Write a protein that binds this ligand. Structure first.
Ligand SMILES: [Mg+2]
Ligand SMILES: [Zn+2]
Ligand SMILES: [Zn+2]
Lengths: 102, 99, 50, 79, 1332
DNA sequence: TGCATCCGTGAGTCGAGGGTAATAAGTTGCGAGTGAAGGTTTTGTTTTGACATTCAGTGCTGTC
């Protein structure tokens, strides 16, 4: 600033916190899923969600899924494919259609 | 010029200057006296906390506008406690007497 | 073309701003004579007269 | 209304309380969403609140008598 | 979260380690290739915080595998980030060094010890030693020892004395001393010898010592041993976009500590010789002060910029820091700028706005409405639907916009009305449309001056933009009772053409039936805008109680005057529109409109005065040219008739008669005496030169010039601006500013000379170099005027206390000046006041004084009445509405909650920008009053006075005065006081050079007490013979009689002194110099004849408020009584006063002229020297103190054409008087001045019936108002704006605290302001303290 | 009661294009640390004895 008005301190941005619009789309991402999880079953919710760690502090895996219900780790991945397939029918992925467009 | 919500600085978490860097305006200290004489208190809380600094305010303002509940939850400016750490830098103890 | 304010004159007091109109209003008047005398095509002898 | 809130001050008695007693009124209808008393006439919530005011319909006491019956009638329901 | 108050004290070095997180030991910040925070570094993760999310550096504890585990290999945790602003670091020094706020400035540490800074500066610079503690009593403490005399103190004794030369040597002097032995021994001898300049240091230390006692501060902490390090979001190290780095300044400054501290603790390990270790501890305080104050102690310190550095305190110092620019004012979102433009079709509450500006600004408000519509599904979907040009985008835009009002702003804000709140209307443009009528509220016009825009997002401020700041809530300005929608240029012109009375128009004389049908006749070409036509109308009055009463009458009126009746809402007479309608009549025609009908018709009315004002100008047309300006032929001869005379006194100047001044003052006159007559040249040639013939021979009427209809309109100027066109344009001058001998003979119609255009720059470039720095001097003056008024908000309805000031006019000087009723208007009466027929008391001790009750006071001839001001109101922390009367802006009874001061601080500092650019005869007949007079019947019959307090005032017979003038001590008159004086009769006469020493007694003269060669000369009159003993002036005469006071004794034939009638005081004139007594010895002089004659702005506003005494104060009379004179010029004359029963002799600069003689009586309230006149606060009351100041600076505005209600200045006089020096003691301290309110507190708890008398009496005090903000109980109100280094030292040595009570305190911290809408909050906060 | 010797303020918004440079030693070991690389290890994922079960591949039986 050639008159005693401005400095280099004015001209730099701190892209650290979040974008205002994008911190809003985090919640609309989150409040999408639980309604999308609401069209499911309780044993069906508990295999797919806590594996990915949604709303839990941890990331459970196929072993901690296996040793708890009974033994099986094989069919839970196949249980989630039925949690994939009925939701990949374009009837409950409308509120997944725009977050698909990230 | 226009700016709804744009970019911010790094030392004081304030909007920026100009039509160039997608900047906000300047609400100068002459205008605060022009605003005090109306007695319009709430806009003076509005035009420093929720529109310049208060980071919990500036999101929960901007999130709540998308709902319609045109409601304020204010706080303290971050340029207030940028002043504390520098007045605390020079061996002076400043603090807050809690209620 | 331009409809502008009259009252910019008397406290700025530019009488000469008015005189930009007065002299040049017949600078058109010369250019309205000859332009009317080229779709008529009299001779050189009137343009050499004018 | 759109032009004037002077008659809204010859009702209450205060220019600044009007900024408060309408805001307390409209916050029950902005997000509380209750029924208005005047017809709408295609207006935002701040305009029906001031049209409520001119006929003497929303006061500081009427904003509290409307809740104090509504408090205990809600507090006669929890048990 | 929420906190009640704050606190500040000196921070202990135990407090610093408890503040911090880890000790910064190495200057490394980032590595040269790996851009990484450094272990044990400045940006260290082990001290200050984490950066990325749950991610350590080397990669051991990640991904929530180990929650609370530090990576012990690298030292770094896993926890939640963004503490890089909250988390401070610290450092432990090796040798302690000194604070520079606590040393350089009194010093405040050497001031504690009464030790000179020069005594410190041999120690803390390592020049010579000083004692710590003499073990033996042979020496004493606080003794500088030079290093060679130190060795003599070594080699004498060795062990019986202790003395260092170090900062520890001062550190030991704070641990050693006690205070309870000192502060009760300063108590012991404060009563011994209380001579002030020794006792004022016994005043300051019993503060300073007992400051530390009851607070808990210790002066050990006053020299640093530990330092705190700023969290690195205050000292960053940022790259640019191009791989280039740019840091804060404090990374450099912090670096100079940690290296230079390191090469001490290493140099200690090697035992460097005792010369070098001194310079080692030298450089620390050289580089510690480099943090605090860069250019303070010695030479400045600059780096590679070759410019000085920004320090730590320079981030809080000046307006470069944070108090003046980043806390009060700020940056802001939701805003923008554009250019203004007019609108002749907007109504007043509306305004224009672009589409592209609002759709870009209201983007958060659209994304809420689209989900309520559902066309957009999610947020990122709705952002996509802006660019795609949906018709619902502009169907939600208007639906967001409607009833959401919007601020507009312009710089410079000069008063309250610079910001307003209109309603939007959309337009297909890119420039902010604006109402034309608000250009009086901004002093602005349309040359591209940009304007800001702002949105009140919350519900509450949107109501403020509708209830408070909506542009139809406030029409009446707080300067006076005339509105601010004075119509500006063409609406004042469109009327003035239309309402007119010529005979030119066809149709004059036939009768019409109604103001509708004039449309059918004037537009058809049977009527004219001005044709004088009889019309039958139907007006309406309110002779009932708020109810319309009809009447219908006929008026021989004009046609264009009748069409204005189509709008006016049936309350005004037809006589109010029966004139030419200039700017004078129109503004009252709004004022009388809302005087009668209330406010809301006058906002509908001014709408429909703007729509007609352009429309009948669009019929009319106003055209100018060169033909409209006419020079009369009386230009050639009028200058030629003086042109023969400019060689005449030049030829006298060749004959050598006339001097320089008598010829210069005559060439300036006759060159301009005809220039006075060039106004008389163009009056009768250009006012009624028109000849239009109409049923007679000719007609003399108004002009057809189309210029004099523009100035009687009020658009630009008056009859002094044509003189620079039609005649010659006055005189000219130099930028030095001396008036020219040869003025101009040309103008703008004929053509000036190349030299007349040369010297024309001189009056014009100066005339713009003047005002371009006269806008700086008011933006100064406003900024401190708003600081004394930062506490002022109403509290209560009534204090109910004693009465106050008295309302009279200011009619001195000439005619009527101010009507009393207008100064009466707006107020509440103080005293029980009546009508001139006795005891018709129109008040119940208080009445609101509106305009109809003002008509009563204009009806009666009575002209004196008392009215409560802010001085007689005595509610603490505010004023009362029963002492304010009318809020001039809102125009009714002032409520509770409003501000007071800042409206006046905006009022008074606004037109400072618009400001800077013999015998006394009777006028008319009436009564005669001249009292407080002691006089005599002279040798000529009439009233000759011999007193100071007398002057002439001219009255009518009723009692309300017309004129008044000062008459001198000793003025000869021609009629008597209490008589009848006709109009035009010469009353007074006096020589201006002499002040007479006229003899009031009658006796013989005798040449006594002067013998030639001692106190006098002999100067006989060689022409006449008549000369008495001629007194000489103060320096020429002999000193042998300079101790003898020279007196011509008035004697009689026996040998006495002829006494004054009434007294036994001897009558002899102790005559000072230059006063030649005329008559010789033995002559009887009369009563009343001269023995001897004694022949001979805006920074002006910045005296009247800045509480400054002049350079030539006119002294008053301290105590009355029979006074003598005193000493003979040992610097100055002294004055021996002996009262009637009472008890002083003091300096007199006797080289000016004194008033009272050696043995004359004086009364208190009389000047003893001449000149201009704090003293009037000291000896007189309180109301007359406010009287001279209010009647001086309001007087300035009348001189340069502004009107301001005098209450606004009276608001400041109350804030000019806050303090009270105290006389006695018993409850508190003795003589230090304190808050007058608190001095009214302790009378009400201890002088009241708890104790008969234990208190202390007190006068009123007066600070300068630039320091009354610095001398305050709050401190951040004083640290926000000026001298931030000083006010944060003294605030911390005492252990102050704040209550956040001022309104500058609630605004910086993000609280709600304690006024207006927020005052109704803050008392619930106030009532929750006393209850819980 | 001066005599000077330093202290410290001078309105307010936008636009403006981008920017630094002086100087200086090598040679020598040896330590701590960025890579590639040993592929084995804890965890994703493949088929077979069989049984309660759903179900489809055999003929049957029954009706209209
Ligand atoms: Mg302009
Ligand atoms: Zn690590
Ligand atoms: Zn009062």
């Amino acid at each position: 600033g050639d008159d005693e008005d401005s400095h280099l301190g004015d001209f730099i941005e701190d892209t650290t916190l979040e974008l205002p619009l994008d911190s809003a789309t985090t919640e609309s991402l989150r409040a999408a899923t639980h309604d999308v999880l609401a069209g499911l079953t309780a044993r069906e919710a508990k295999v797919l969600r806590m594996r990915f760690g949604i709303d839990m502090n941890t990331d459970y895996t196929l072993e901690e899924v296996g040793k708890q219900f009974d033994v099986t780790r094989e069919r839970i991945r196949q249980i989630e494919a039925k949690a994939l397939r009925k939701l990949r029918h374009p009837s409950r992925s409308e509120v997944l259609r725009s977050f698909l467009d990230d | 010029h226009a700016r709804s919500t744009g970019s911010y600085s790094l030392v004081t978490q304030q909007p920026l200057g100009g039509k160039a860097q997608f900047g906000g305006q300047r609400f100068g200290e002459m205008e605060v006296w022009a605003l005090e004489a109306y007695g319009a208190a709430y806009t003076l809380q509005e035009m420093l906390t929720v529109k310049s600094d208060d980071v919990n305010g500036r999101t929960k303002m901007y999130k709540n506008i998308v709902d319609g509940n045109h409601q304020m939850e204010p706080g303290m400016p971050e340029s207030f406690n940028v002043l504390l750490k520098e007045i605390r830098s020079l061996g002076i103890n400043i603090e807050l007497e809690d209620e | 073309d331009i409809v502008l304010n009259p009252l910019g004159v008397p406290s700025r007091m530019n009488i000469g701003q008015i005189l930009e109109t007065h002299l040049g209003m017949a600078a058109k008047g010369i250019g309205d004579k000859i332009n009317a005398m080229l779709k008529q095509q009299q001779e050189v002898a009137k343009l050499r007269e004018f | 209304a759109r032009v004037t809130v002077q008659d809204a001050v010859e009702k209450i008695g205060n220019r600044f309380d009007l900024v408060l007693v309408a805001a307390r009124r409209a916050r029950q209808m902005q997000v509380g969403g209750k029924d208005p008393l005047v017809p709408e006439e295609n207006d935002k919530t701040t305009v029906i609140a001031l049209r409520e005011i001119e006929e003497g319909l929303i006061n500081n006491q009427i904003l509290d008598v409307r809740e104090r019956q509504e408090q205990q009638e809600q507090e006669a329901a929890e048990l | 979260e929420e906190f009640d108050a704050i606190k500040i004290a000196l921070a202990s070095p135990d407090m610093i380690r408890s503040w911090s997180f880890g000790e910064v030991k190495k200057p490394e910040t980032i590595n040269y290739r790996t851009f990484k925070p450094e272990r044990d570094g400045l940006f260290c993760a082990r001290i200050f915080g984490p950066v990325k999310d749950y991610e350590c550096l080397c990669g051991k504890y990640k991904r929530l595998k180990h929650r609370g585990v530090i990576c012990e290999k690298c030292g770094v945790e896993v926890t939640q980030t963004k503490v890089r602003r909250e988390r401070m670091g610290h450092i432990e020094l090796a040798s302690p060094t000194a604070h520079i706020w606590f040393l350089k400035s009194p010093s405040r540490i050497g001031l504690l010890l009464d030790m000179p800074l020069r005594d410190i500066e041999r120690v803390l610079y390592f020049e010579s030693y000083v004692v710590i503690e003499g073990g033996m009593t042979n020496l004493e403490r606080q003794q500088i020892l030079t290093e060679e005399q130190y060795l003599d103190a070594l080699e004498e004794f060795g062990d019986e004395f202790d003395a260092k030369m170090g900062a520890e040597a001062i550190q030991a002097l704070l641990k050693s001393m006690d205070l309870e032995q000192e502060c009760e021994q300063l108590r012991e001898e404060l009563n011994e010898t209380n001579s002030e300049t020794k006792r004022k240091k016994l005043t300051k230390r019993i503060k300073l010592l007992e400051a530390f006692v009851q607070s808990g501060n210790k002066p050990e902490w006053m020299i640093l041993t530990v330092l705190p390090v700023l969290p690195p979001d205050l000292r960053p190290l940022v790259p640019l976009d191009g791989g280039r780095f740019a840091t804060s300044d404090l990374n450099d400054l912090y670096r100079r500590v940690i290296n230079r501290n390191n090469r001490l603790k290493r140099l200690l390990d090697l035992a460097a010789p005792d010369i070098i270790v001194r310079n080692e501890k030298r450089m620390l305080q050289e580089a510690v002060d480099a943090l605090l104050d860069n250019g303070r102690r010695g030479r400045a310190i600059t780096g590679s910029n070759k410019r000085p550095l920004k320090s730590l305190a320079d981030m809080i110092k000046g307006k470069q820091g944070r108090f003046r620019q980043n806390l009060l004012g700020k940056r802001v979102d939701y805003s923008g700028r554009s250019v203004i433009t007019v609108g002749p079709y907007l109504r007043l509450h509306q305004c224009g706005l672009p589409k592209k500006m609002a759709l870009e600004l209201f983007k958060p408000f659209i994304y809420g409405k689209l989900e309520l519509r559902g066309l957009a599904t999610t947020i990122k979907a709705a952002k996509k639907m802006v660019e795609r040009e949906e018709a619902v985008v502009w169907d939600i835009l208007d639906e967001v916009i409607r009833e959401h009002p919007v601020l507009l702003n312009r710089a410079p804000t000069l008063h309250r009305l610079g910001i307003q709140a209109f309603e939007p209307v959309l337009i297909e443009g890119k420039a902010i449309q604006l109402h034309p009528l608000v250009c009086a509220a901004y002093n602005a016009d349309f040359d591209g001056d940009q304007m800001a825009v702002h949105v009140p997002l919350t519900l509450e401020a949107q109501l403020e933009a509708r209830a408070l700041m909506m542009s139809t809530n406030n029409i009446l300005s707080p300067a006076n009772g005339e509105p601010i929608i004075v119509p500006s240029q063409d609406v004042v012109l469109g009327l003035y053409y239309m309402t007119r009375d010529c005979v030119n128009a066809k149709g004059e004389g036939m009768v019409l039936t109604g103001p509708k049908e004039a449309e059918r006749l004037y537009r058809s070409g049977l009527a004219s805008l001005h044709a004088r036509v009889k019309v039958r109308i139907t007006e309406y009055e309110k002779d009932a109680n708020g109810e319309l009463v009809a009447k219908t009458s006929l008026k021989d009126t004009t046609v264009g005057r009748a069409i204005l009746w189509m709008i006016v809402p049936k309350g005004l007479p037809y006589s109010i529109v029966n004139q030419a309608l200039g700017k004078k009549a129109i503004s009252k025609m709004l004022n009388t409109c809302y005087r009668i009908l209330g406010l809301k018709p006058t906002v509908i009315f001014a709408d429909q005065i703007m729509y007609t004002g352009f429309a009948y100008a669009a019929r009319s047309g106003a055209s100018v040219g060169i033909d409209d300006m006419v020079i009369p032929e009386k230009k050639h001869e009028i200058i030629s008739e003086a042109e023969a005379e400019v060689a005449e006194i030049q030829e006298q100047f060749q004959s050598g008669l006339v001097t320089a001044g008598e010829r210069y003052n005559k060439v300036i006159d006759i060159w301009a005496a005809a220039n006075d007559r060039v106004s008389k040249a163009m009056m009768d040639n250009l006012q009624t030169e028109t000849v239009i013939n109409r049923d007679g021979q000719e007609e003399k009427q108004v002009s057809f010039n189309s210029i004099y209809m523009m100035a009687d309109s009020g658009a630009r100027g008056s009859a002094a601006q044509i003189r620079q066109l039609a005649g010659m344009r006055g005189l000219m001058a130099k930028p030095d500013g001396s008036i020219i001998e040869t003025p101009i003979t040309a103008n703008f119609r004929e053509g000036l000379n190349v030299l007349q255009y040369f010297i024309s720059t001189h009056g014009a470039r100066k005339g713009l170099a003047d005002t371009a720095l006269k806008t700086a001097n008011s933006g100064y003056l406003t900024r401190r005027l708003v600081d004394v008024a930062q506490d002022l908000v109403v509290t209560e309805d009534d204090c109910g206390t004693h009465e106050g000031i008295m309302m009279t006019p200011v009619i001195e000087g000439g005619d009527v000046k101010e009507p009393l009723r207008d100064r009466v208007l707006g107020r509440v009466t103080a005293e029980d006041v009546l009508k001139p027929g006795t005891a018709d008391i129109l008040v119940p001790r208080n009445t609101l004084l509106h305009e109809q009750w003002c008509d009563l006071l204009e009806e009666n001839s009575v002209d004196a009445v008392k009215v409560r001001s802010v001085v007689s109101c005595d509610t603490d922390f505010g004023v009362c509405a029963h002492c304010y009367g009318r809020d001039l802006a809102r125009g009714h009874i002032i409520n509770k909650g409003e501000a007071i001061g800042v409206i006046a601080a905006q009022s008074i500092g606004e037109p400072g920008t618009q400001l800077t650019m013999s015998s006394i005869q009777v006028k008319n007949k009436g009564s005669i009053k001249l009292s407080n007079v002691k006089s005599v019947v002279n040798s000529s019959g009439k009233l000759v006075i011999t007193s100071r307090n007398t002057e002439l005032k001219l009255i009518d017979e009723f009692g309300r005065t017309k004129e008044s003038y000062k008459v001198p001590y000793g003025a000869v008159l021609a009629k008597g006081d209490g008589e009848q004086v006709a109009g035009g009769e010469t009353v007074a006469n006096w020589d201006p050079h002499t002040m007479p020493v006229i003899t009031e007694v009658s006796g013989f003269v005798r040449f006594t007490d002067m013998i030639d060669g001692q106190t006098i000369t002999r100067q006989t009159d060689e022409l006449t013979g008549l000369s008495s003993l001629v007194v000489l002036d103060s320096a020429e005469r002999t000193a042998g009689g300079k101790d003898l006071r020279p007196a011509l004794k008035i004697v009689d034939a026996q040998g006495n002194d002829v006494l004054i009638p009434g007294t036994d005081m001897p009558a002899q004139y102790f005559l000072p110099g230059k006063a030649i007594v005329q008559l010789e010895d033995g002559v009887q002089i009369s009563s009343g004849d001269t023995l001897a004659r004694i022949p001979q702005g805006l920074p002006r506003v910045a005296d009247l408020f800045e509480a400054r005494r002049p350079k030539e104060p006119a002294i008053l009379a301290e105590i009355s009584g029979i006074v003598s004179f005193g000493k003979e010029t040992k610097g100055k004359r002294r004055l021996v006063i002996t009262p009637v029963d009472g008890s002083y002799e003091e300096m007199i600069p006797k080289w000016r002229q004194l008033n009272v003689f050696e043995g004359e009586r004086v009364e208190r309230g009389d000047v003893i020297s001449d000149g201009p006149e704090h003293d009037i606060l000291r000896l007189r009351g309180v109301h007359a103190v406010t009287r001279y100041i209010v009647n001086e600076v309001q007087d300035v505005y009348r001189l340069q054409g502004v009107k301001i209600n005098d209450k606004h200045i009276e608001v400041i006089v109350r804030q000019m008087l806050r303090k009270a020096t105290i006389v006695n003691a018993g409850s508190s301290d003795f003589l230090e001045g304190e808050q007058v309110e608190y001095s009214r507190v302790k009378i009400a708890n201890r002088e009241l019936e708890a104790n008969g008398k234990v208190g202390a009496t007190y006068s009123r005090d007066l600070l300068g108002i630039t320091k009354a903000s610095l001398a305050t109980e709050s401190f951040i109100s004083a640290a926000s704006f000026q001298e931030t280094t000083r006010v944060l030292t003294e605030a911390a040595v005492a252990g102050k605290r704040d209550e956040l009570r001022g309104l500058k305190e609630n605004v910086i911290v993000g609280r709600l302001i304690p006024a207006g809408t927020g005052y109704a909050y803050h008392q619930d906060r106030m009532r929750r303290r006393a209850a819980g």
